[PDB]
Design a binder for this molecule. Sequence first.
Ligand SMILES: *P(=O)(O)OCC(C)(C)[C@@H](O)C(=O)NCCC(=O)NCCS[C@H](CN)CS(=O)(=O)NC[C@H]1O[C@@H](n2cnc3c(N)ncnc32)[C@H](O)[C@@H]1O
Lengths: 64, 1039
Amino acid sequence: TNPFENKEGTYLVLINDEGQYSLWPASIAIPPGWNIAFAENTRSACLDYINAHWIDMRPNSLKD
Amino acid sequence: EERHQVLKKWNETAHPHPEENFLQLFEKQAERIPEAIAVICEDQALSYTELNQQANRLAHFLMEYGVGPEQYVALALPRSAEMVIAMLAVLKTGAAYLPLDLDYPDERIAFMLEDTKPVCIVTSSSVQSKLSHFPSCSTIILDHPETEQAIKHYPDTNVPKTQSPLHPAYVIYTSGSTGKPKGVVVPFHSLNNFLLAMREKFALKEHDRLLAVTTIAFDISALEIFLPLISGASLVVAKKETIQDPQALAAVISDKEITIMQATPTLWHMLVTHHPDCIAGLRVLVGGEALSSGLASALHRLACEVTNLYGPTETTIWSTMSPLPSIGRPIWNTQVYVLDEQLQPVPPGVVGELYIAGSGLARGYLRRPDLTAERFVANPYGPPGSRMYRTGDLVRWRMDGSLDYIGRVDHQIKLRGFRIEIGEIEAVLSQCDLVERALVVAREDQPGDQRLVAYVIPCELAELRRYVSERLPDYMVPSAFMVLNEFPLTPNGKIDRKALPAPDFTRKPRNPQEEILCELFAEVLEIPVVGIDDHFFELGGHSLLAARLISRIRDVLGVEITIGKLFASPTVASLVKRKPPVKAYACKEDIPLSFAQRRLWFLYHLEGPSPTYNIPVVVHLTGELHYQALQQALYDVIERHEPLRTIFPEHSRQVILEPHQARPELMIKEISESELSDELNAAVRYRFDLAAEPAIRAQLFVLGPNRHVLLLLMHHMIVDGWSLTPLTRDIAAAYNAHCRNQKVEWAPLPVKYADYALWQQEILGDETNPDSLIAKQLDYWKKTLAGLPEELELPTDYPRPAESSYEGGIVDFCMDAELHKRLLDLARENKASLFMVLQAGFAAFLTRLGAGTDIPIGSPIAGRNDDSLEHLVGLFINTLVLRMDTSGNPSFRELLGRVREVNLSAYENQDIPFERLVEILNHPLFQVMFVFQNTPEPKLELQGLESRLEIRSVGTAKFDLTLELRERRGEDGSPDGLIGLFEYSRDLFDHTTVEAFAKRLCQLLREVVMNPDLPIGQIDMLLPEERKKLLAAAENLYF
Ligand SMILES: *P(=O)(O)OCC(C)(C)[C@@H](O)C(=O)NCCC(=O)NCCS[C@H](CN)CS(=O)(=O)NC[C@H]1O[C@@H](n2cnc3c(N)ncnc32)[C@H](O)[C@@H]1O
C-alpha cells in the first residue's frame, strides 16, 4: 500500500517556507526545507489540522 | 553509485526562460505577420491582427470592469473564435479563466460556479439561456449590441505584462471518483513552461494547421489553442457536431488541409478503422490512455511523427512525451522520481510508484487543503521545500533514459473513456455456483479495437452473461466468454496473453420503430447489422457514440433520450420500452378469431373458397432425400404449431384438431420437368374449404432420383411472412433430427396462437373505457382517416366491373445498386428512412398519374411486439393506412417531411387491428398497397441437400395495385440494389401499362435523387421510347 494511503498509521504535518502544508509518514525521514507543524498523530487529526490552518493556499511570496 | 543516474543524469531537464511569455510570443508574431491566418472556424476566419486587437480591446474592457489577478471569470461560450479571443483576453488581463462546457449536467456546472465563485460570467446569446445563474455574479453577454459596442471603445494596443507568475492562469476540474470534483488551480508559469516546451518540440512552420477537437473542459485544449498561435501556424476549431460524426471529421481533416492534430486513442481508433486516408500525412499526438500496440502499429505505418504523451492534470497538461508502452523522458523543468514504499529511488528495471516534480506542479486543489497535502507531498530529491505529486501510476525505468508504464495502484484499467475495475467483474463472474475461477483481460481482435474477454474455469453457458449483466454495468460485461483448462504463464512468471485461446469475437426488429433504431445503432457503431437484443457498449460503444446516437434518434424519431436512460437500456428492445403482456390462457369453451383472421373469414364467407390468399412455398431439393424423415418432419411441425391444424366453422370460432385427429397427408407424384411449371400452376390454385379442412397441403414432385420439388401450399389464414421463418427452421430441425436419429432440439412455445387471439379480444374489450389505450388510438384513427376519398382515380384501361375477377398479373423490375445507395444517402441526410423515401416517391408517382392530391396507401406490419410471439407460426400481420397529401405542388424534400410526420404519427398507434377500424368507420379504406421488405428470404438448409426456395405467385390480385420492394444487402453489408414487383388487377390494367408504371417509377426516383428540391409537378414522366416519336412528329411538322 501507498505510504500516504495507509489509514491505520502514524503521520505528521510538515510546513513549507511558502506556507504550503504536506502530510508525511512518521517513519520516513523529513526532507530538507520542511519543518514539523503538527507532531505525531492520527492521519485524520493531521488532515484536520491542515484543514484548520492552511486557509489561504497561495504562496507567501504573494502575501504582503 | 547508480542512484546518481536515476536522480540527476536522467533528469537533466533545465531551461531558463528567455524572458518571454507565450503571450508575448503571440504579440511578436502578430507584429511580424499581420495578414496571416490565425483562427478558422466553420465559414469565418480571423487573422493574427484581428485576433490580437479584439483580444486587447476585450482585455481593457474587462480590466475596466474590475478584473485582476487571483480572480476567475467563467467562459460559458460556444466553440468558436469568440472563445479563443475570450480566454486570450483573460490571460492578458492577468486574471484566470474558468472554462465551462455547457453540455455537462446543470448540477456540475452549478457546482463549478458555486465552488469557484467567479467575479463575472461572460457568454454568448447562443448560450445565455442555458445558464440558470446565481446572484453571486453578473453576466456579460458579448453578443449584446450594447456590450459589443462598449468593447470597441477601448484600446486595441498590447497590455503591460507586469504580473506575477505564481498567480493562477486557469482552473480545471476533475472527477477522481471521489464523488466530488476538485478544482486544479494551475499557475501561470507552469502553463508558460509547458507551452514553450511544446513550441520548442514541434517546429510548426507557417504552413502548419492544427485541428482542435478537445473540449475546453480539459487542459489539453490549451495545447490545441495556444501552441499554433505562439508559432506562425493557423488553428482550425471544430464544433462538437463535427467531432461526433467520423465521416464529417475525416472530411474536415482533408478539406481544411490539417497538418497536425491531438486526440485520445478512442477518437484515433474511430478514424483509422474506417477513414485511414485523412491520416496519411498527419502529425499525430496521442495521450490520455495506454496506446494499444496494434493501434500504434497502424499509426506508425499510415501516419507520421506519432508522439505519445503522458501526464496528470496536477502537473499541467503533459509531463512526459516520446516519439514511437513508452511514456518516455520528462519535458523542460520536470523531474521524474520512481520511488518505493519508503520513498527511496529504485534501480533501473525495478517497478515503483511515479512521483512528478518541477515547474509543472499546480498550486493544488481549490479550497481543498487536505487533498493537496495528501498528494502534493514534500520532495526530498529537489530544492529545499520542493514538492512532489504522487501519480498513483506504477512505472519502471527502461534501459536508456525511458519509462515503461505498468498500471495504476488501484488496479483499475482505463478503456474507451471508462475506469473499469476488473476485480469486481471477475468477482461477480466467479460468484456463480457453477464457476470456480475467472480472469478478465482486454484483447484486440481488430486493429485498435480493445474488447474485454473473460476466461473462465468451471467448478467440479450463455446464461452466465445474463448473470453478469444483471449485476454489472453494460460497459463492464465481457464481449466474449472462453472456458479454459488453466491460466498459462511466461518464464518471467506472468500470465501469457499469447498463450490464451484466441477470442471468438461473436433477433430481428418487430415493428418499424425497432428497425429504425437498429439502423441507427448499425450506423453509429459502423457495423453492418445489429439486432433487437444487442448491447451498445459491448460493441465498442462509448460516450461520444452515445451522444451521436442520441442526436440521430432525436432527429429520426423525434424523441430526446437522456444518456443515462441509454446506459440503463443499452439494447433496442429495452429502449422502446404500453401493451399488456400475453400470459398463457386457460382452456376456453370457444376460441374467437384473431382480428386479422376475421377479415379473411368474412371474405371467405361472402365470396366462397378462393385461391386469392394462398401462400405456396416452393422448394427445389437436389441430392439424396429421405422421404420418411420428411413426412415425420411435417407431422411434427404440424403437431407443434396448432394453427397448421385448425378449422373455422360457422356459429366464427377456432377449432383446433388433435394431431391424430387431423390426419396429415403427403402427396407424392412423379412428373417430367417440362410439366413442372404446369402442374405447379394448378397445384397452387387449390381452393381450401376453411370450414372443414386444415389450410395446408404437402406435395412432393419427383423430377429425378436426386432432383425434387417440395410444395407447401398454405393459406394466409394460418401463416404470415414472419411465420415462414420459424416454420422453415422447424421442418429442417425435425428432418435433420430423424436422419441423425436423435431427438429434435426444439424451443418450447410459452403461448399458442389461441392465446394471441384471446389476448387480442381481451384487450379490445376495453374499447368502452375512454381512458384506455385502445380507445385513444381508435380516436386517433377516427380523426386522421376522417373524410377519406371513396376511391382513387388511376389511369385504368378498363372501367371497374361489378364482379371483381380477382385475376392478377405481376411485373418484375430492378433498381441498380448505385441508385439504391443514393436513395439510402438521401434518406439518412434528410432525417428519414428508405421506407419513407420510397413512400414519397410512390405517392408522387400516383399523384403525377392523376390519382389526386389525397392518397391513402396501406402498408403491412409484423404485429409481433410481444416476445412470446417470436417463434409462433400464425397470422399476426396488421396494416397501417398511411394517408398522404401531395397537394400544394411541393418539393420531394417537403413531401418527404410530410410522409415522415405521417409515418411517425402512425407508429404510435400501431397497436390496433385494421379490421376494427374497418368495422368502426363503415378494399374498404385503400385500393393501393405498398409492401416493403428489408429482411432476407427464408431458406430450408436441409442436411445433404441443395435447397432453393421461392414463393410462387397464384396469379391473383389482393388489391387494385400493389407495389412490393425488397432491399437486398451485399456480402459485406453494403447496398446491393432493390428488387421490386407490381401486382396489378388483370381486369383494370394491361401488362404493358403497369410495365410502363415500373419504368416511370424508377425514372422518377432517379429524378428526385439528382435533385431533391425539385417540385413533384416538374418531374419528367415521359419514357425515352416516347420522347423519340414525340420529337419525330415535330421534326416532321416544322420541317
Ligand atoms: P460520457 O459518459 O459523457 O463521458 C466520456 C467522454 C468520452 C464523453 C469523456 O471522457 C471525454 O470526452 N473524454 C475527454 C478526453 C479527456 O478528458 N482526455 C484526458 C486529458 S486530461 C490528462 C492530461 N492532462 C490525461 S489523464 O487525465 O487521463 N491522466 C490521468 C491518468 O491517465 C493515464 N494516462 C495518461 N497518459 C497516459 C499514457 N500516455 N499512457 C498510459 N496511461 C496514461 C494515467 O494513468 C494517469 O494517471
